Ligand binder design. Structure first.
Ligand SMILES: *[C@@H]1O[C@H](CO)[C@@H](O[C@@H]2O[C@H](CO)[C@@H](O[C@@H]3O[C@H](CO)[C@@H](O)[C@H](O)[C@@H]3O)[C@H](O)[C@H]2NC(C)=O)[C@H](O)[C@H]1NC(C)=O
Ligand SMILES: *[C@@H]1O[C@H](CO)[C@@H](O)[C@H](O)[C@H]1NC(C)=O
Ligand SMILES: *[C@@H]1O[C@H](CO)[C@@H](O)[C@H](O)[C@H]1NC(C)=O
Lengths: 400, 338, 145, 96, 50
C-alpha cells in the first residue's frame, strides 16, 4: 500500500503507475505536478535609484568671509568662494569689490521617483521548495494539495497521505547575489553596501525606502559661479542608476535554463524541470477491494493498429479481451517504453476496445498489464512528416 | 466652377470620432485623423480628418470650415487651422474631409484648428519621411537644379479619379437628450431626428419618435440615448458604429489624386577629374549623400556603386574598352585610355 | 475641493531668478526653470518654474497665473503659456511652482507665457528622451496594443 | 536669509506613480518549419529585440535588436526552444 | 516583394497575402485596430539593387 517511486520532475506529464498490492485488486495511481515553486530564502541588502541634488539657497555675505561647517548631510559638499560680484534684476548686489564671498552647499538626496522605481539587491540562500500536486487515482479522480520537498512533511488532503522529495538536484538558477528591478530579475553582482563607485551601479545606496540614512558617492564638486550671477554650478557624475538601466543584460527570467520562470514574488522559480523526486504515498486500505471480485481476462491477445513514431499519442492498438464478468479494469504498462493516456476500461464478455498511447521506438515491444493479465503488444511505428503537436508526453527517449 | 462638386458638399456632414491623443489624452475630438497618406515624393501629405473643410452650410465660404460640436454642427471660419509635425507644416489646400500640406520630416502628425476660446486639436503616431526624387538624398527642395519625373499629389480638387463610400452613418449616443421629467428619464429630439430608445428595464423598445418620456427606468446611465440622423451622410470611418439597417451608397470623389508631376531635384557639385596611365582618379566634394555608380563597357560589366557622404577621392582602372560613371544625377560620362 | 491647498496658495509668493538663456542672453526672467524631471515613460515632464501659477491674488481664478514683476506681483491671464522642446509641447496641468506637460524628445526645454505686450520666455539645456515601456523601442504612444 | 529657515513644508504637486501606459505591438512573425530547425520570417515595424532560450541544460541565450526586415534561424533541439518576439507573450516549441 | 499582385491596373480581382489579423479594441473605445505586416512594396523600394 505504501508505494514508493521515483518520479521525473516535469509539470505537464502524468505518472499513471500501478500499485501491486497483494491480496487485493491492484489500483492505478496518477500524479501530476502543477507547480514546482522553489522560493529560496532571501535577505535584502539595499535599494538604489536615481538621486536628486537638493541644493539649498546660497549664503552671500556682501563684505566679509564666512567659514562653512561640516554638516551631517550625505555627501554634503560645501565650499566658500572669494571675489564675486553678483548682479540681480535690481542691480549689483553689494558695494564691496573683493570682500564679497559666497557660501554654496549641496547634498545628495534620493529622488522622489525612488518610491515607485528602485532596484533591489538580494543575497539568497538555498531555501525550501514547494509544489502543488494533483492526484486523480483510484475512483476519487481529484486532489488539490500544496506540498513541500523536505523528506519529512506528510500531505493528507482528501483520504490519501504522501511525502515528496527531497530533490535530486540542488540546482538553483539564482546566484548568491541577485538584483530585482521592479518586475525582472538580474543576477548582477552588486558590490556591497556603502562601497559603490561613482557613476557605476549603486552610486546611491539606501538600506530601505523608510531608512533616512544612505550612502551617496556621486563625486559631487561645486565650482565658482561665472560672470557674477547668483547660482550654484555643481559638477557631478551622471546618475549611476540611469546607467545600467539602458544597458543591462538579459533578465534571469529570460536566460534561466530548464524552462524556469520567475515573478515579483518570494522569488519562486516555477516549472524548473530538473532532477527527480522520490515520491512515497500511503494509500488507505479502504479503496482496496478483494481480489476475488475482479473478472478474469486471461487468454487474451493484443494487436497494434497504427503507431506513429512521434511525441503525441499517435499509437493506437486493439485488445481482444477474453473476460468472464463485467467491471472496471485499470490499464498500465510497467515498462517505460510506451505511455498510455487511457486509464480505465470497462470489460464486456469477450469484447474489444481500442486505446491510445505514444512511444519512441521504431518497433515497440512493451509489456501491457491489464488488471492482472500480461500481454506484449509488439508492432511497428512510422515517423510523422508534420511535426506540429503539443509538448512531448512520451518522455522516453533512449536507444532505438 | 467650384460649386460643381455638390455630391460631397451638401450630401455629407462631418462627425466626431475617437482621436488617439486628443489634447493630452484619448478624448473624442471633432478633428479625428484618418488615413495619413505620406507617399508623395516632395514631402507632401494628404490627411483625412473627420471634420469637413471647404464650403459653408449650403455652397459658399471656401475660407470656412464645418465641424460637429455635440449633436449639432456649427460652421465657423478657417481662422487658425494648422497642421503640425516635428516642425510646423504649411497647408496648401483643404477640401471636404481632406487636407493637403507640405510637412518637414518627422515621426508624429498633428492637425488642429483654433475655435478662439479653445484649441481642439488631434494627433496620431504616423511617421512621415522625405524621399528625394533621383539619386541625391537631400532633405529639402532646392531653389535650382535639374527637374525629374517625380510623383506628387495635385493641388486641384475637381477630379473624379477615385471614390470613397459614404453610407448612412451609424447612430450616435447623446446622454444630454436624457433630461429628467421630475422623477423619470426624459428624451428630447434634435429636429425630429430618429431617436433609437430603450432601457435595461422593460419600456418603449424601438424609439422612432418625437420627445418621449420613460415609464419604467429611472437612471440616465441605464438607457439608450441614440440619434439616427442619416438625413446627412458620413464617411465610412472605422471609428463609428455601423447602422445595421443597411449601408447607403453615395460615393464621392477623392479630392487630391496623385499625379506624375515634375519636381525640381538637387544637382551635386561637379567632380574634379585627374588621371594617370589607364587610371581615372576622381575627386568628389558632395554636400549631401549622393549615389555614385560606375560601369565598365567591356565584356565584364564589373559594376560598382556606393553612397558617399564625406568628401573623398576614389580611383578607377580604365581599360581600353572604356568606362562610364554617373555622379549624382548629372548626365553619364564615358572615357578611353592610352 | 481645490481649496484644500492654501499652504501652497497663500503662504507662497511669485519668485524671479537667473534664467541662463532668457531670450537672447541671460536676463533675470520671472519664469526661470529648475529641476526638470524627465524620467517618466509616456513622454510627460514635470517642470518647476520660478513663477508660481495657481489661484489668483486671494482665492479664485485657478486659470490664472501670478508672476513677480519688479517689486510687486501681478496676477494675469494664462493665455499663451508655452512649453517647448525640439518640437512644441502640449500643456496638461499646473499647480504652484510646478507645471506638468508632455514633450517630444529634444535637447532643450523652453517655457514662456504672454503678458501681452511682452514675450517673457526662458529656456535651459537639458536632455529629454522617452523610451516606451516594453521591448519595442518606439517613439510615440500608439493607438492600440 | 541669514535669520532662519522658516516652516512651510509644501507637498510636491505631481508625484510619480506606477500607472499603466499603452505600448506598441509588433506584427506577428511568419513561422516556417524545417527539420529540427525553426525559421522565423518576420518584419519589424520599429526596432524590437527578440530573445531565445533553450529549455535544456545549456541556455544558449541570444538577444538581438532588429530594425530592418530579416530572416533568422534557430536549432530547435529535442529539449525544446522558446522565443519572445517583441512584447508578445512568450511561446515555446518542440522538436519532432 | 509582390505582397499585393493584380493582373492589370483595372483588374477587379487581386491577390494579397499580407498577414492581416484583427486585434481586440483597446479600453472600450470604438475603433478597428489591426495587426498588419509592413508594406511589401515599400521594402525593396529602399534596398533595391543596382
Ligand atoms: C488532475 O489531473 C487530471 C489528469 O490530467 C485532470 O483531468 C482532466 O480534467 C479536465 C478538466 O479539468 C478534463 O477536461 C475537461 O472535461 C470537461 C468535462 O468533460 C470538459 O467540459 C472540458 O471541455 C474538458 O475536456 C480532462 O478530461 C481530464 N483528464 C485528462 C486526461 O486531461 C484533473 O482535472 C486534474 N485535477 C485538478 C483539480 O487539477
Ligand atoms: C587610389 O586609391 C587609394 C585607396 O586604395 C587612395 O588612397 C589613393 O589616394 C588613390 N590614388 C591613386 C594612387 O590612384
Ligand atoms: C536560414 O535558413 C534559410 C533558408 O532558406 C537559409 O537560406 C539561410 O542561409 C539560413 N541562415 C542561417 C544563418 O543559417
Amino acid at each position: 500500500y505504501e508505494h514508493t517511486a521515483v518520479m521525473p520532475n516535469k509539470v505537464g506529464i502524468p505518472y499513471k503507475a500501478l500499485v501491486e498490492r497483494p491480496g487485493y485488486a491492484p489500483v492505478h495511481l496518477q500524479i501530476q505536478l502543477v507547480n514546482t515553486r522553489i522560493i529560496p530564502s532571501t535577505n535584502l541588502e539595499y535599494i538604489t535609484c536615481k538621486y536628486k541634488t537638493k541644493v539649498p539657497s546660497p549664503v552671500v555675505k556682501c563684505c566679509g568671509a564666512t567659514q562653512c561647517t561640516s554638516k551631517p548631510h550625505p555627501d554634503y559638499q560645501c565650499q566658500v568662494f572669494t571675489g564675486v560680484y553678483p548682479f540681480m534684476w535690481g542691480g549689483a548686489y553689494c558695494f564691496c569689490d573683493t570682500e564679497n564671498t559666497q557660501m554654496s552647499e549641496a547634498y545628495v538626496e534620493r529622488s522622489e521617483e525612488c518610491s515607485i522605481d528602485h532596484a533591489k539587491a538580494y543575497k539568497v540562500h538555498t531555501g525550501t521548495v514547494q509544489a502543488m500536486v494533483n492526484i486523480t487515482y483510484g475512483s476519487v479522480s481529484w486532489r488539490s494539495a500544496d506540498v513541500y520537498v523536505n523528506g519529512e512533511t506528510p500531505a493528507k488532503i482528501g483520504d490519501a497521505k504522501l511525502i515528496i522529495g527531497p530533490l535530486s538536484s540542488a540546482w538553483s538558477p539564482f546566484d548568491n547575489k541577485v538584483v530585482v528591478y521592479g518586475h525582472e530579475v538580474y543576477n548582477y553582482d552588486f558590490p556591497e553596501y556603502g562601497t559603490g563607485k561613482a557613476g557605476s551601479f549603486g552610486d546611491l545606496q539606501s538600506r530601505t525606502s523608510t531608512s533616512n540614512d544612505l550612502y551617496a558617492n556621486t563625486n559631487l564638486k561645486l565650482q565658482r559661479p561665472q560672470a557674477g550671477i547668483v547660482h550654484t554650478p555643481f559638477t557631478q557624475a551622471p546618475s549611476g542608476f540611469e546607467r545600467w538601466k539602458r544597458d543591462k543584460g538579459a533578465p534571469l527570467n529570460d536566460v534561466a535554463p530548464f524552462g524556469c520562470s520567475i515573478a515579483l514574488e518570494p522569488l519562486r522559480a516555477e516549472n524548473c524541470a530538473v532532477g527527480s523526486i522520490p515520491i512515497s504515498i500511503d494509500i488507505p486500505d479502504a479503496a482496496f477491494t478483494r481480489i476475488s471480485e475482479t473478472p478474469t481476462v486471461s487468454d487474451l491477445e493484443c494487436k497494434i493498429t497504427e503507431c506513429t513514431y512521434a511525441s503525441d499519442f499517435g499509437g493506437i492498438a486493439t485488445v481482444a479481451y477474453k473476460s468472464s464478468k463485467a467491471g472496471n479494469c485499470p490499464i498500465h504498462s510497467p515498462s517505460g517504453v510506451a505511455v498510455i493516456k487511457e486509464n480505465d476500461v470497462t470489460l464486456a464478455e469477450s469484447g474489444s476496445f481500442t486505446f491510445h498511447f505514444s512511444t519512441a521506438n521504431i518497433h515497440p515491444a512493451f509489456k501491457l498489464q491489464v488488471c492482472t493479465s500480461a500481454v506484449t503488444c509488439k508492432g511497428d511505428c512510422k515517423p510523422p512528416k508534420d511535426h506540429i503537436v503539443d509538448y512531448p508526453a512520451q518522455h522516453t527517449e533512449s536507444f532505438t | 466652377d467650384l460649386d460643381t462638386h455638390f455630391t460631397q458638399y451638401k450630401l455629407a456632414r462631418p462627425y466626431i470620432a475617437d482621436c488617439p491623443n486628443c489634447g493630452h489624452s484619448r478624448c473624442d475630438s471633432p478633428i479625428a485623423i484618418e488615413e495619413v497618406r505620406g507617399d508623395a515624393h516632395a514631402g507632401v501629405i494628404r490627411i483625412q480628418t473627420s471634420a469637413m473643410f471647404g464650403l459653408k452650410t449650403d455652397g459658399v465660404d471656401l475660407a470656412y470650415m464645418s465641424f460637429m460640436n455635440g449633436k449639432t454642427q456649427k460652421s465657423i471660419k478657417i481662422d487658425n487651422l494648422h497642421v503640425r509635425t516635428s516642425a510646423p507644416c504649411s497647408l496648401v489646400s483643404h477640401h471636404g474631409y481632406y487636407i493637403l500640406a507640405q510637412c518637414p520630416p518627422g515621426d508624429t502628425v498633428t492637425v488642429g484648428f483654433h475655435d478662439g476660446p479653445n484649441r481642439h486639436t488631434c494627433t496620431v503616431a504616423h511617421k512621415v519621411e522625405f524621399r528625394p526624387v533621383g539619386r541625391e538624398k537631400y532633405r529639402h527642395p532646392p531653389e535650382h537644379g535639374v527637374e525629374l519625373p517625380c510623383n506628387r499629389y495635385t493641388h486641384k480638387r475637381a477630379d473624379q479619379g477615385h471614390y470613397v463610400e459614404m453610407h448612412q452613418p451609424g447612430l450616435v449616443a447623446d446622454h444630454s437628450l436624457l433630461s429628467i421629467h421630475s422623477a423619470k428619464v426624459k428624451i428630447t429630439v434634435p429636429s425630429g431626428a430618429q431617436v433609437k430608445y430603450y432601457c435595461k428595464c422593460p419600456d418603449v423598445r424601438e424609439g422612432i419618435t418625437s420627445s418621449d418620456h420613460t415609464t419604467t427606468c429611472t437612471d440616465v446611465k441605464q438607457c439608450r440615448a441614440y440619434l439616427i440622423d442619416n438625413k446627412k451622410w458620413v464617411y465610412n470611418s472605422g471609428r463609428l458604429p455601423r447602422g445595421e439597417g443597411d449601408t447607403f451608397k453615395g460615393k464621392l470623389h477623392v479630392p487630391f489624386v496623385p499625379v506624375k508631376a515634375k519636381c525640381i531635384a538637387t544637382l551635386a557639385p561637379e567632380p574634379l577629374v585627374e588621371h594617370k596611365h589607364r587610371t581615372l582618379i576622381l575627386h568628389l566634394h558632395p554636400d549631401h549623400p549622393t549615389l555614385l555608380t560606375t560601369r565598365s563597357l567591356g565584356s565584364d560589366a564589373n559594376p560598382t556603386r556606393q553612397w558617399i557622404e564625406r568628401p573623398t577621392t576614389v580611383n578607377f582602372t580604365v581599360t581600353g574598352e572604356g568606362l562610364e560613371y554617373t555622379w549624382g544625377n548629372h548626365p553619364p560620362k564615358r572615357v578611353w585610355a592610352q
